[PDB]
């Protein structure tokens, strides 16, 4: 399967302030380096899986 | 009761997985009941009955083989594994349905970028399925499960009394005397 998604970079969306001020006008920014997808697989019996 | 007639603790074996040779046997102290100081006459009989109800080595062999059969990780491919090993060899190499041009012109062939013989899937799978050139296992070394089928834990009453068997901790008998050796 392919599972493509997109991450928000808007400071006002992704971040929450205790004052509600405009973070874009207040110098908030984010840089994504490595966004990996983890997964847990039950090692259930291949015969029974 | 009499402790001379009491059933002894079984000897469990040590496998030594890396060399593969048996590492010896030990008195099965790791699973023992504490029955003489707290138990007394009521539990001495119970402990004896538990000890003599230890399965005989044939029964333990059958139980272990049955446990191993339900593994799903047998050494050779079952229908699940062999089906996918056939599936990937089928979809490997040049496709059979690809109608490509064979140009036997000694001047002015085609470029044929692509992506006049072919190998059949029977031989193609035969290459993938065949085993080694040995086809016989070396003596002494055994895998864990083949060691568990043999070398079974068993009660050994009066072991150090016979004519010339003693035991197998770690040795190599040489001169008709049991030489527990390799020091």
């Amino acid at each position: 399967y392919t599972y493509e998604w997109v991450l928000r970079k808007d400071p006002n969306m992704i971040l929450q302030s205790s004052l509600g001020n405009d973070l874009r006008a207040d110098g908030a920014s984010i840089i994504y380096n490595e966004v990996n997808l983890m997964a847990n697989f039950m090692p259930m019996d291949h015969n029974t899986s | 009761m009499n402790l001379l007639n009491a059933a002894p603790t079984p000897y469990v074996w040590k496998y030594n997985p890396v060399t593969g040779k048996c590492a010896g046997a030990q008195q099965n102290y790791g699973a023992t009941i504490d029955w003489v100081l707290p138990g007394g006459n009521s539990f001495a009989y119970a402990a004896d009955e538990i000890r003599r109800r230890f399965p005989e080595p044939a029964v333990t062999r059958a139980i272990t083989a049955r446990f191993e059969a339900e593994s799903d990780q047998q050494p050779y491919a079952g229908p699940h594994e062999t089906n996918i090993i056939t599936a990937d060899v089928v979809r490997s190499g040049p496709p059979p349905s690809a109608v490509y041009p064979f140009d036997p012109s000694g001047v002015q062939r085609v470029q044929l970028s692509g992506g006049p013989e072919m190998t059949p899937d029977a031989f193609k799978y035969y290459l993938r399925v065949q085993g080694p050139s040995q086809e016989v296992d070396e003596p002494g070394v055994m895998s864990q499960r083949q060691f568990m089928t043999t070398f079974l834990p068993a009660m050994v009453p009066h072991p150090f009394d016979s004519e010339s068997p003693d035991a197998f901790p770690a040795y190599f008998s040489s001169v008709y005397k049991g030489t527990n050796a390799f020091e």
Binding site: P43, M44 | K14, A31, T60, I63, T64, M148, L152, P153
Partner: protein, 49 residues
């Protein structure tokens, strides 16, 4: 400057007593665990380190 700051990720876990279950899937399937009665430990002596 952002190059003059660090990060110091750390955790505290009091009263926990780290537990590793002797089970194949690391989950609870009974007090007598999955590998507890596997006749590869029960019948053969192993010297763990």
């Amino acid at each position: 400057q952002p190059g003059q700051v660090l990060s110091y990720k750390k955790f505290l876990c009091d009263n926990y007593l780290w537990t590793i279950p002797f089970s194949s899937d690391f989950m609870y399937m009974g007090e007598l665990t999955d590998l507890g009665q596997n006749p590869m430990y029960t019948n053969n002596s192993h010297s763990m380190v």
